[PDB]
Each structure stands twice: as structure tokens, then as C-alpha cells.
Enzyme design. Structure first.
Site, PDB file in Angstrom:
ATOM      1  N   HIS B  41       0.873  -1.192   0.216  1.00  0.00           N
ATOM      2  CA  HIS B  41       0.031   0.457   0.435  1.00  0.00           C
ATOM      3  C   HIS B  41       1.283   0.978   0.038  1.00  0.00           C
ATOM      4  CE1 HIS B  41       0.778   0.879   3.438  1.00  0.00           C
ATOM      5  NE2 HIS B  41      -0.303  -0.212   4.738  1.00  0.00           N
ATOM      6  N   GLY B 143       3.106   6.037  10.105  1.00  0.00           N
ATOM      7  CA  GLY B 143       4.226   5.830   9.225  1.00  0.00           C
ATOM      8  C   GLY B 143       5.215   4.499  10.296  1.00  0.00           C
ATOM      9  N   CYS B 145       4.463   1.714   9.144  1.00  0.00           N
ATOM     10  CA  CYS B 145       3.825   0.115   8.431  1.00  0.00           C
ATOM     11  C   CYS B 145       5.045   0.068   7.981  1.00  0.00           C
ATOM     12  CB  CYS B 145       3.336   0.502   7.408  1.00  0.00           C
ATOM     13  SG  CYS B 145       1.832   1.014   7.969  1.00  0.00           S
TER      14      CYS B 145
HETATM   15  O1  LIG Z   1       0.656   4.227   9.063  1.00  0.00           O
HETATM   16  C1  LIG Z   1      -0.420   3.928   8.163  1.00  0.00           C
HETATM   17  N1  LIG Z   1      -0.098   3.993   6.167  1.00  0.00           N
HETATM   18  C2  LIG Z   1      -1.707   3.933   6.239  1.00  0.00           C
HETATM   19  C3  LIG Z   1      -2.070   3.961   4.843  1.00  0.00           C
HETATM   20  C4  LIG Z   1      -1.843   2.541   4.340  1.00  0.00           C
HETATM   21  C5  LIG Z   1      -2.216   3.189   3.096  1.00  0.00           C
HETATM   22  C6  LIG Z   1      -2.421   5.144   1.958  1.00  0.00           C
HETATM   23  C7  LIG Z   1      -1.811   5.449   2.265  1.00  0.00           C
HETATM   24 CL1  LIG Z   1      -1.428   7.486   2.852  1.00  0.00          CL
HETATM   25  C8  LIG Z   1      -2.246   5.703   4.343  1.00  0.00           C
HETATM   26  C9  LIG Z   1      -2.534   3.045   7.279  1.00  0.00           C
HETATM   27  N2  LIG Z   1      -3.664   2.555   6.450  1.00  0.00           N
HETATM   28  N3  LIG Z   1      -5.104   3.228   6.408  1.00  0.00           N
HETATM   29  N4  LIG Z   1      -6.368   3.372   5.989  1.00  0.00           N
HETATM   30  C10 LIG Z   1      -5.872   1.833   6.135  1.00  0.00           C
HETATM   31  C11 LIG Z   1      -6.235   0.851   4.735  1.00  0.00           C
HETATM   32  C12 LIG Z   1      -6.306  -0.700   4.940  1.00  0.00           C
HETATM   33  C13 LIG Z   1      -5.057  -1.113   5.343  1.00  0.00           C
HETATM   34  C14 LIG Z   1      -4.176   0.128   5.700  1.00  0.00           C
HETATM   35  C15 LIG Z   1      -4.863   1.089   6.005  1.00  0.00           C
HETATM   36  C16 LIG Z   1      -2.652   2.983   8.656  1.00  0.00           C
HETATM   37  O2  LIG Z   1      -3.144   2.267   9.210  1.00  0.00           O
HETATM   38  N5  LIG Z   1      -1.677   3.041   8.869  1.00  0.00           N
HETATM   39  C17 LIG Z   1      -1.461   2.602   9.930  1.00  0.00           C
HETATM   40  C18 LIG Z   1      -0.649   2.033  10.748  1.00  0.00           C
HETATM   41  N6  LIG Z   1      -0.451   1.609  12.030  1.00  0.00           N
HETATM   42  C19 LIG Z   1      -0.715   3.055  13.608  1.00  0.00           C
HETATM   43  C20 LIG Z   1      -1.136   3.714  12.450  1.00  0.00           C
HETATM   44  C21 LIG Z   1      -1.828   4.431  13.763  1.00  0.00           C
HETATM   45  C22 LIG Z   1      -2.826   5.713  13.021  1.00  0.00           C
HETATM   46  C23 LIG Z   1      -2.746   6.058  11.805  1.00  0.00           C
HETATM   47  C24 LIG Z   1      -1.767   5.445  10.932  1.00  0.00           C
HETATM   48  C25 LIG Z   1      -1.855   4.105  11.195  1.00  0.00           C
END
Ligand SMILES: O=c1[nH]c(-c2cccc(Cl)c2)c(-n2nnc3ccccc32)c(=O)n1-c1cncc2ccccc12
Ligand SMILES: O=c1[nH]c(-c2cccc(Cl)c2)c(-n2nnc3ccccc32)c(=O)n1-c1cncc2ccccc12
Ligand SMILES: [Cl-]
Lengths: 305, 301
Positions: B41, B143, B145
Site C-alpha cells: 500500500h 508511519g 508500516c
Molecule cells: O501508517 C499507516 N498508513 C496507512 C496508509 C495506507 C495506505 C495509504 C496511506 Cl496514505 C496510508 C494505514 N491505512 N489506512 N487505511 C488502511 C486500509 C488498509 C490498510 C492500511 C490502511 C494505516 O492504518 N497506518 C497505520 C498503521 N499503524 C498504526 C496507525 C495509527 C494511526 C494511523 C495510521 C496507522
């Protein structure tokens, strides 16, 4: 989100651990520049541990009595001296992996990461706090002496603990890296025990802020308290005094959550007087006191090193 | 003596952490030999996440659209490939700090260490468990991931988790290093339900054995139970059933302490039914379920 017992990344310290052997004793040393630091009781037999005079015991050793193993290479010891309870072995090679570092002595209540080692080899890493009674509730087996505790700030490792002994109740005692024990403990066989401990108030407050940051808010209330009125309650429950400095250090967490420190203090007051009534905070049924205010900031703000 | 939530030393994993940037997104990657692994992603915008066609989106990307940084040294991407829900970015240089490693898929109830990273740099290390519902109760911010979970199995780093997402519950989901998700979760925006989180019974028993090894004995009793009768009380309290394999895995601890596994089940049965009556076990007022039998033996001997 989430909140865990979180240690500093340990790689910088791993690159400094070596094995120190004297006679039939092996333990761990810390190799920084061209010096290896370890507990001076490495020179002792169990028989020596009664009324030892380390000045005698060390003058009966020479450089060749110390074997320092750094992975697959043997470091030759070219001098030795003792700084209070810490033995300093001068070696012919500076550790090429020496990080930027400081030696600091921490205050009761402050936390650090412990890199538990055996035979010079890192085994695990966990968080500890220096207890108000100057013990640490570590996890250490025979052979772990010389394991160190540390904090990191930017690129600088601040070493604050070297492990020396286990006490009768299973808690632990050690020194700073300048050779002074924390508390009244000594590297000799004596019939002493840890004294009565207290709860680290500023840390409990930091952890309540961590709970709010993570959405656990059920313990908050409308009240505030003065610092003196809070401390009158805290002392009754065997909590450490909260100082104005502690209030200042909690400022960043108060700004992030919008909850004034003295407002949090009134929440803690009510938890002490009423208990938690079957509920939990961040997965605990007790009030956790081994997270400092900085521990909460570094975890909840994603500080890197 | 003592018993702590203990993680593996992180240095070998630190040496593999890199920063991966695609467009305006930065997350973490794992650099092993000449490959960098990261969540696929990374190529999505938040709008892409609503209904992502990963195959189409990846086709549109070029090698130079992936910026990889190891510390302050930049790596050039020379290939990019789907790997289920992760990407393999082939780079010009084998990581000289690659440890001996393998990719292992772990089982619910098993524990691992996490090195939480931001922008390719480590923040901290902690221990956690794969929950029975295939989430993990982690500590992760935006951030994080691409941060990985691992065990150090003797001479080898066993990578078992790569972080992908935080669920609305505040718990976490991700893949193994082959890119296959743990549990029913997917890397797209859904009304994803998380299964029932239950307590890992074999781990609670292991931790009770840890307590006896460390001198806490008050919870032992002279009652008896069968495995079937114990399991009826267990699922009443949302504990996982204890299997015959669990009983044998607790073998080493039962032999060390002299307490039969079913006798410890009788102790846990009473604790579940009556509570702790204001007492604590290993400094806890709750029963701990994120130490495996192996964790206890490793830490206690
Ligand atoms: O860092 C991340 N990036 C993203 C992201 C993914 C794709 C594009 C962009 Cl631009 C961003 C997340 N997403 N968002 N929808 C999703 C849907 C399915 C899978 C992942 C997803 C995500 O969940 N996280 C996070 C990971 N762990 C803790 C977190 C705490 C607070 C906010 C985010 C946290
Ligand atoms: O490893 C160790 N070595 C020694 C030791 C010291 C000198 C010579 C020798 Cl031959 C050994 C320890 N002692 N013993 N008496 C002491 C008296 C004052 C100071 C330290 C002492 C000691 O406490 N520990 C341990 C440290 N942490 C956990 C432990 C768990 C189980 C067993 C030991 C543990
Ligand atoms: Cl608890």
C-alpha cells in the site's frame, strides 16, 4: 495507538558487549574505546566475598589473568584499574563500534533499558525503573553480571546501570558506570535486604496521560487539587512526593491532552481513595509506575534514534 | 530471579531497516540481500485505499518512483514485483549487514519482538503475541508500516510479521514476510470486523509456572480436574481450549516445578472462579497471557 513496555533499540549497546573471564568466573563487560568495564567482583571467589578488601584482591592479579573475548577475537589487556566498584581493563584495541556515549547517574523513579547478556552475548532487552528503595526489579540469572542499563537521546547512549547482584527477595542491585552502587548495597556478602519501597507518583501520572492519549478516560474527573493537598493524600498510600519539578516535567503531556497536571492529580487522588472498581487502564488492574514522562512522549510521538 | 516482558535484542534487525518513499508516502522497508520488502500500500493514496487495483497501480509505477534510503545512503531500485500484499524492490546492492535469516509464519498464541520504526529509523522494541483473532496488541503510529516482528531462533533471525494497518479497535494487523495477511484482514478500506479476542490459556499456565519458579505459590491448591472439565470452565471465561499438545508443551515446566499440568489447571480454575482476592502474581493483578512456555524456560533458565 497502543502502549507497550518499550525498550530503546539495543544495537548500539550490543556492539559493545564482550566476555570477561578471570579464573573460573565469566561475566560480561562493556567495551567503549580502549576500555572494558565490568564488575570488580569478577576477581573474587565466593570465599573472597566475606569482608573482601578489593585493593588486596586486585593487586594479586595481573593483566594476563583477565581474558576478554570480543566475538571471535581476543583483546589483550594492557592495564587495569578500579574505579570504586567497577573494574576498568585497558585493552590494545579501541572498539570500532563505540557509539557516542555518556555515563550518567539516574534518580529513583527514572527508567532505562536493560540489555541482559550471558557470556558476552546479548540475550534480551527489557525496561526497568530504579525503585525508590534503590533496587531494580530485573530479570537476571547467574552469569548476567556486567549487563548494562541505558537510555538514548538522539545518537548518544547514556549508560546508567551495571548489574552486580541479586538480593534475597529476587530484586537486583548494581552501580552506575563510575562505580558507585545505587542505594546502601555493597559488593560483599552481607545479611542486608531491600528496604520498604514506594510507588513512583510522577510515573503513575505519566501513564495516566498515556492512557488518555490512547482513549482510556474513565478515571478523569472535574476536580483539581493543589500540589500540597495532593501530597498529603499521596503519602498516606505510600506514594513518593510529587515535586514542582515533576509538575514541570509533565507539562508536555498536559499540553498534548489538554488536561492540567493538577487536574490529573485529582484523578489519581480519587483512584487511590476509591480503587479501580473492577476496571482496567491500558490493560492493567494496578496503577503502573515504570513509565517516565519521557517514556510516554517517546512512544506516543514516535521518536527515533 | 525476576520475570519481565523481554524482547530479543534488535541490532540484527536494525541493520536491515530502510526508508521507502513513493510519492508523498514514506514508510519502512526490510533490506535483506539485494531485496527490500515493504507493504504494497506504499503505492496508494488515501483515495486509492477506498478501492485499490493493486495490479493496475503497480503497473503505473517505475523503478525510479521508489526511493530507498539506508541511513543517509541512497539505494537504487532496479526492479519491483508483487509479493502477495508486500512488494519486493530489487536494489543494486546486497545489504552487507544481512543476518542469517528465514521467513516463518507464526501461529496464534506465539510471541515475537517488534522493532517499531519511522522513516526507516528505529523508535523502540517490545514483545507481543499473535492474538487468537490474528490481531496484535501493538504500539504503532502513522508511519510505522513496514516495521517487522521477529524471533531470534538460535543462529537465525526468524521474521514473522510486517506491519500494515491499525484497526478501528486500536489493535494491529499485518502479513508475514511472504506478504500473506494473518487473519481475515485486507489492505483496503473495509468494514472489517475483528474476531473474538480470547485469552491464550497455555500461556497463562506457563506464566503461573514462572510464578512458582520465582517463589509465588499461594494459588496452588489440592483440587483436581480433568482436561475436559477444565476446558468447560475455560471457555466460560473466554479462554481458549487447552489441547493435548498444549499439555505436552508445558511438560518441561511441569517437570521442573513438580506440578502436574492438570493440577495447575485446577489452580487456574479457582483463580477464574474466585479471582485473586487482592493478591498479585509476578507483580500483576490480572492473569498474563503473552508469555509462551518457551519464553518462560528461556527467561527462567
Ligand atoms: O501508517 C499507516 N498508513 C496507512 C496508509 C495506507 C495506505 C495509504 C496511506 Cl496514505 C496510508 C494505514 N491505512 N489506512 N487505511 C488502511 C486500509 C488498509 C490498510 C492500511 C490502511 C494505516 O492504518 N497506518 C497505520 C498503521 N499503524 C498504526 C496507525 C495509527 C494511526 C494511523 C495510521 C496507522
Ligand atoms: O551472577 C552472579 N554472580 C555473583 C558472584 C559474585 C562474586 C563472585 C562470584 Cl563466583 C559470583 C553474585 N553474588 N553472589 N554473592 C554476592 C555478594 C555481593 C555481590 C554480588 C554477589 C550474584 O548475585 N550474581 C547474580 C546476579 N543476578 C542474578 C543472579 C541469579 C542467581 C544467582 C546469581 C545471580
Ligand atoms: Cl495488572
Amino acid at each position: 495507538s497502543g502502549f507497550r513496555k518499550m525498550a530503546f533499540p539495543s544495537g548500539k549497546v550490543e556492539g559493545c558487549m564482550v566476555q570477561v573471564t578471570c579464573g573460573t568466573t565469566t561475566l560480561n563487560g562493556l567495551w567503549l574505546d580502549d576500555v572494558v568495564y565490568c564488575p570488580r567482583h569478577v576477581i573474587c571467589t565466593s570465599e573472597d566475598m566475606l569482608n573482601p578488601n578489593y585493593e588486596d584482591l586486585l593487586i594479586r592479579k595481573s593483566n594476563h589473568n583477565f581474558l576478554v573475548q570480543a566475538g571471535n577475537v581476543q583483546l589483550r589487556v594492557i592495564g587495569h584499574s578500579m574505579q570504586n566498584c567497577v573494574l576498568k581493563l585497558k585493552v590494545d584495541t579501541a572498539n570500532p563500534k563505540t557509539p557516542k556515549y555518556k555515563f550518567v547517574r539516574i534518580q529513583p523513579g527514572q527508567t532505562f533499558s536493560v540489555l541482559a547478556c550471558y557470556n558476552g552475548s546479548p540475550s534480551g532487552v527489557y525496561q526497568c525503573a530504579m525503585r525508590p528503595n534503590f533496587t531494580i526489579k530485573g530479570s537476571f540469572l547467574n552469569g548476567s553480571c556486567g549487563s548494562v542499563g541505558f537510555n538514548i537521546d538522539y545518537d548518544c547512549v547514556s549508560f546508567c546501570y551495571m548489574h552486580h547482584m541479586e538480593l534475597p527477595t529476587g530484586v537486583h542491585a548494581g552501580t552506575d558506570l563510575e562505580g558507585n552502587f545505587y542505594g546502601p548495597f555493597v559488593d560483599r556478602q552481607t545479611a542486608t535486604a531491600a528496604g520498604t519501597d514506594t510507588t513512583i507518583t510522577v510515573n503513575v501520572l505519566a501513564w495516566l496521560y498515556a492512557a488518555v492519549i490512547n482513549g482510556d478516560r474513565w478515571f478523569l474527573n472535574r476536580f483539581t487539587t493543589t500540589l500540597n493537598d495532593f501530597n498529603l493524600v499521596a503519602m498516606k498510600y505510600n506514594y513518593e512526593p510529587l515535586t514542582q519539578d515533576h509538575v514541570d516535567i509533565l507539562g508536555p503531556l498536559s499540553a498534548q491532552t489538554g488536561i492540567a497536571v493538577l487536574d490529573m492529580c485529582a484523578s489519581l487522588k480519587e483512584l487511590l481513595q476509591n480503587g479501580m472498581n473492577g476496571r482496567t487502564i491500558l490493560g492493567s488492574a494496578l496503577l503502573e509506575d515504570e513509565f517516565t514522562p519521557f517514556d510516554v512522549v517517546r512512544q506516543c510521538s514516535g521518536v527515533t534514534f
